[PDB]
Amino acid sequence: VVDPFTRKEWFDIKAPSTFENRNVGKTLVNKSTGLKSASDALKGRVVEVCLADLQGSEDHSFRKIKLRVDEVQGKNLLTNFHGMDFTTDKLRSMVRKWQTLIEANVTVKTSDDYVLRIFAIAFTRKQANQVKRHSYAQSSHIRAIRKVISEILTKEVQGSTLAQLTSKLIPEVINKEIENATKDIFPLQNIHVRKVKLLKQPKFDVGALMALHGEG
């Protein structure tokens, strides 16, 4: 008897311009009223997006990005980075029977005071003539791999910010240097960064939000 789809508006969200598809989609609020604003009901939304749709490719579809609504500008609103996971089909589809699973996480606050807790998954693999059936790892080796992965993640994040982090996590260059950095201990297929998370935001940083946005 009220029918609120005569009330819900249409807002077009915009992504940081690290991603080639700046446009994503349109969310909806109820009416901008006195004492209760549509901007106020918009202040805290989190959007999950398939990184295939953002990058315009198809092979990159195994990832997902969490954007955070923080500012709105006149039927237009800007999003900020909040977290990254893989998708569950890919995480399970990697995890095989008969190989150890090297897995590590580290907490680090960046140059700007975003702290991030950042994860890295790598497996074991065969080597092209291995007649042994399974190929596990000694756990002292998995200790060495966690050490190297902790070093390389804290080095390739701590001296940067959200923008350079995004530019590193899109084309898979970190795990490229990881694979290249530990050919010399154990084989390790499927080296990946599976989960990054924002924990503590700095002060509101909306100038760097325009440094994401604002070109177009």
Partner: protein, 91 residues
């Protein structure tokens, strides 16, 4: 020699009172009348003064705390959760 088998410091409570309550007061009298390790001076030199008051008698210090020991389980959880949340404030 051996004074008593199982009553300890509660020969001052005699044949009275019921053995159960003499158990609880045996344990808690051991606690509130035993010395403790002063972390401020590294000496086993503490005693109790009142509920809460724990004094170190060599380095002449005082510290508030549990009515029968230097610290309780509740205060252990309190110091850890304050340390956690203060760290994430720092972060």
């Amino acid at each position: 020699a051996k004074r008593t088998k199982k009553v300890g410091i509660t020969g001052k409570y005699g044949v009275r009172y019921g053995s159960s309550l003499r158990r609880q007061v045996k344990k808690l009298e051991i606690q509130q009348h035993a010395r403790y390790d002063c972390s401020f001076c590294g000496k086993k030199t503490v005693k109790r003064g009142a509920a809460g008051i724990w004094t170190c008698s060599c380095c002449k210090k005082t510290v508030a705390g549990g009515a029968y020991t230097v610290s309780t389980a509740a205060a252990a959880t309190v110091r850890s959760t304050i340390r956690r949340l203060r760290e994430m404030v720092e972060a």
